[PDB]
Paper text:
To obtain sufficient iron, S. pneumoniae evolved two major highly conserved iron ABC transporters, which are termed Piu (for pneumococcal iron uptake) and Pia (for pneumococcal iron acquisition) systems, respectively. Pia system is responsible for the transport of hydroxamate siderophores such as ferrichrome and ferrioxamin B, whereas Piu system for the transport of heme from hemoglobin. The overall structure of PiaA is composed of an individual N-terminal and a C-terminal domain linked by an α-helix. The N- and C-terminal domains face each other to form a hydrophobic and plastic cleft.
The structures of Se-Met substituted apo-PiaA and ferrichrome-binding complex were subsequently solved at 2.7 Å and 2.1 Å, respectively, by molecular replacement. Each asymmetric unit of the apo-PiaA structure contains two molecules, which are quite similar to each other with an RMSD of 0.24 Å over 278 Cα atoms. Segments 1 (residues Asn84−Lys90) and 2 (residues Glu248−Glu252) at the entrance of this cleft are missing from the electron density map due to their high flexibility. Notably, Segments 1 and 2 are located at the N- and C-terminal domains, respectively, indicating the cooperativity between the two domains. Different from E. coli FhuD, the most N-terminus of apo-PiaA structure has an extended β-hairpin, which may function as a hinge to connect the N-terminal transmembrane α-helix that is inserted in the membrane of Gram-positive bacteria. Superposition of apo-PiaA and PiaA-B3P against the ferrichrome-complexed form gives an RMSD of 0.31 Å for 262 Cα atoms and 0.45 Å for 283 Cα atoms, respectively. Superposition of the complex against the apo-PiaA structure revealed that most residues in the binding cleft undergo subtle conformational changes, except for residues Asn83 and Tyr84 that locate at the invisible Segment 1 in the apo-form.
Numbering used by the authors: 40 to 83, 91 to 247, 253 to 340
Write the structure that this text describes.
């Protein structure tokens, strides 16, 4: 197997008997394909849906201690035939260091800029299951499509609505992050029927000033990580409270440090697990748009 990526070409094992994954989501792609990794990146350490699939494949979860950074000794100790990194933020040196252990399936373009469909495409190809990658993508799309046609009143409230995904901190509202269309969590919203406003363009996210906030003023609905005081807080903000979607209360707050929060960057396993919960949260927010 030949694989082209941001760092060149990778000769991969057609039948990898031992699979390691790093970064976010990559393990879910392997797992959704019936492969239990010999080790995958510990999450901030396993999400409910990742555990559910591991159990269903009669496996156990082996975790790399990837919090402070890549654990090169851990990945090496698991003895992989392939390292899945289709969605990751690896640097040129990361790729080189990792390549001394096993062939690496890196992202195609730039760090942290891989849509959930491409993540499957790269990770499945690196496992010698490119055709099965097609089916996984199709099955995942079917799950999304049948959820929206299943609840036409939620579909009706959210379709056509312009949306921005943000990271806002109540501690500091002078600066906040906007996720771009190259970000998997933002682009996922377009799979749901939402659209991007005219003020979005590259990177996966960009810092913006609250003065530049009137550029985000053409969004119908806003999504951000937060808590039960987030919306009330943003409405109280001298500048951010003047924004359309915030003023209207059309803000979808994803509870920070919950499984729902992690699923925002979608995998076929996470989508299958949290889409009802995610649509319900979006549905109510878009009611205020």
């Amino acid at each position: 197997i030949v694989l082209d990526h941001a760092f060149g070409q990778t000769i991969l094992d057609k039948k990898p008997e031992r699979v390691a994954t790093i970064a976010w989501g990559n393990h879910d792609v392997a797992l959704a394909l019936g492969i239990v990794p010999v080790g995958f990146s510990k999450a901030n350490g396993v999400l409910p849906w990742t555990e559910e699939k591991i159990k269903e494949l009669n496996g156990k979860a082996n975790l790399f201690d990837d919090l402070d950074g890549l654990n090169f000794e851990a990945i090496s100790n698991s003895k992989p035939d392939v390292i899945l990194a289709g969605y990751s933020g690896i640097t040129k040196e990361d790729y080189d260091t990792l390549s001394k252990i096993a062939p690496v399936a890196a992202y195609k373009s730039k760090p942290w800029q891989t849509l959930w469909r491409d993540m499957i495409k790269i990770d499945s190809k690196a496992l010698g299951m490119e055709k099965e990658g097609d089916e996984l993508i199709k099955n995942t799309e079917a799950r999304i499509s049948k959820e929206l046609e299943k609840h036409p009143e939620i579909k009706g409230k959210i379709k056509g609505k312009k949306v921005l995904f943000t990271m806002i901190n109540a501690a500091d509202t002078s600066k906040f992050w906007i996720y771009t269309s190259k970000d998997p969590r933002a682009n996922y919203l377009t799979d749901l029927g939402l659209v991007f406003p005219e003020s979005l363009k590259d990177s996966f996210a960009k810092e913006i000033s609250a003065e530049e906030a009137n550029k985000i003023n053409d969004a119908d609905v806003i999504i951000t990580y937060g808590d039960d005081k987030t919306l009330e807080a943003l409405q109280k903000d001298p500048l951010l409270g003047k924004i359309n979607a915030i003023k209207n209360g059309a803000v979808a707050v994803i509870p920070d440090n919950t499984p729902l929060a992690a699923s925002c960057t979608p995998t076929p396993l996470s989508i299958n697990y949290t889409i009802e919960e995610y649509l319900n949260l979006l549905g109510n927010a878009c009611k205020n748009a």
